[PDB]
Paper text:
XPD (xeroderma pigmentosum group D) is a 5′-3′ superfamily 2 (SF2) helicase that unwinds damaged DNA during the process of nucleotide excision repair (NER). The major enzymatic function of XPD is to unwind the DNA double helix around lesions such as photoproducts to allow repair. In eukaryotes, XPD is one of the components of transcription factor IIH (TFIIH) along with nine other protein subunits. The mechanism of XPD helicase activity remains unclear with uncertainties about the binding of the 3′-end of the translocated DNA strand, the positioning of the junction between single- and double-stranded DNA and the role of protein conformational change in unwinding the DNA.
The crystal structure of SaXPD, obtained from crystals that grew after an unexpectedly long (3 months) time, revealed the absence of the HD2 domain, which most probably was proteolytically cleaved. Interestingly, the rest of the domains maintained the closed conformation, with the Arch domain being only slightly shifted compared to the full-length protein, probably due to lost interactions between the Arch domain and HD2 domain. The crystal packing positioned the Arch domain from a symmetric molecule in place of the missing HD2 domain. Remarkably the structure of SaXPD with HD2 missing adopts the same closed state as the full-length protein, consistent with its stability, recently highlighted by spin labelling and mutational analysis of residues at this interface in TaXPD. In contrast, the integrity of the FeS cluster/domain is greatly affected when not stabilized by the contact with the Arch domain. Overall, the data indicate a highly stable closed conformation of the pore. However, in the case of Sulfolobus acidocaldarius XPD (SaXPD) the ‘pore’ does not actually exist when the molecule is viewed as a surface, rather a pore appears only in cartoon representations.
Residue numbers in the entry: 8 to 283, 288 to 346
């Protein structure tokens, strides 16, 4: 339009969450960066997946000719570690034992995101530095950053980074996608996972405990493709959990000795038992259903955070209040 912008700046300066219904594909990155100047020193774009880094990179290279700004993004350890294979979870990455953990290089973000990451992996192996910690370090300095939904909304991933969100104007584009944040975790335990953990194991005691757990699971689960409540779920004592936990560490040590980090199945199991809640049977698997969508989005109610939501098909005010649980004052602008 013009300068619905002083509206946005005033909105943010009054601690209103700004919800912007905007016709799509219209220089949105430039708009957000301009309105940040007046509000916050840095900008954070929260995006669905790492595939949304590229369009942001494309848009602000145009901006970089008129204004000097640094862009950085975070990809997980599984996408940046020198030794990671497909299937490797972030906690499986054995940085505790790796010589490169404290080996950082200065990153130059004139490359696109996939180009940058591939270059850091190639150079990292030759010149002995860690791509991940190099990206992480570059992230903490940058004027504009971008993170994926898991790193912003999900505790498991949020604990991997050390970032004060109060320094950022937080922009969540395609914000209708926030509706799916409650589908990003799966908190389940299957027969096959346990058996794969038995195969992968490096101690008899761990195999014995995993085997007893496999049996316990079989008594409670039911074959029905239907959620059914379970009384008396399997139990692991503190001392049994100790033995399963040092088995995890032994597999992590061994993997780093090889060039090669794979999925460690016992990690999944131990994380399932951190949550114990009402547990269910679904299709021979034990499941803890995910929280409601408002549990994940509750963070948006903290008045300490300056937040803009934008979308072409933003949900009605009523739905954002009742279903997403946004109870903080909201400046809803239909452009
Ligand atoms: S290279 Fe080493 S330090 Fe870097 S992520 Fe992989 S394990 Fe960790």
């Amino acid at each position: 339009q013009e300068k619905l912008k002083d509206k946005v700046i005033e909105g943010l300066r009054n601690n209103f969450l700004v919800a912007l219904n905007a016709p799509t594909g219209s220089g949105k990155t430039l708009f957000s960066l301009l309105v940040s100047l007046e509000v916050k020193p840095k900008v954070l774009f929260v995006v669905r997946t790492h595939n949304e880094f590229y369009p942001i990179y494309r848009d602000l290279t145009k901006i970089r000719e008129k204004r000097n700004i640094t862009f950085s993004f975070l990809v997980g350890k599984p996408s940046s570690c020198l030794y990671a294979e497909k299937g490797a979870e972030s906690e499986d990455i054995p940085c505790k034992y790796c010589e490169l953990k404290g080996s950082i290089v200065e990153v130059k973000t004139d490359d696109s995101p996939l180009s940058l990451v591939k270059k850091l992996k190639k150079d990292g192996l030759q010149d002995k530095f860690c791509p991940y910690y190099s990206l992480l370090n570059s992230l903490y300095k940058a004027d504009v950053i971008a993170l994926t939904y898991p790193y912003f909304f999900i505790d498991r991933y949020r604990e991997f980074i050390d970032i004060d969100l109060r320094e950022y104007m937080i922009v969540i584009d395609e914000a209708h996608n926030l509706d799916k944040v409650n589908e990003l975790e799966e908190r389940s335990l299957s027969e096959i996972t346990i058996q794969m953990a038995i195969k992968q194991s490096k101690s008899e005691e761990s195999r014995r405990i995993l085997s007893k757990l496999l049996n316990q699971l079989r008594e409670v689960v039911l074959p029905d493709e239907k959620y059914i409540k379970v009384e008396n779920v399997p139990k692991l004592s503190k001392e049994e959990l100790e033995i399963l936990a040092d088995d995890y560490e032994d597999i992590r040590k061994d993997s780093l000795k090889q060039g090669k980090v794979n999925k460690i199945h016992i990690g999944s199991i131990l994380r399932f038992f951190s949550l114990l809640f009402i547990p269910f049977s679904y299709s021979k698997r034990l499941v803890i259903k995910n929280p409601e969508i408002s549990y994940y989005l509750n963070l948006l109610n903290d008045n300490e955070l300056s937040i803009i939501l934008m979308s072409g098909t933003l949900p009605p005010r009523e739905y954002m209040e009742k279903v997403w649980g946004i109870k903080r004052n909201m400046l809803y602008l239909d452009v």
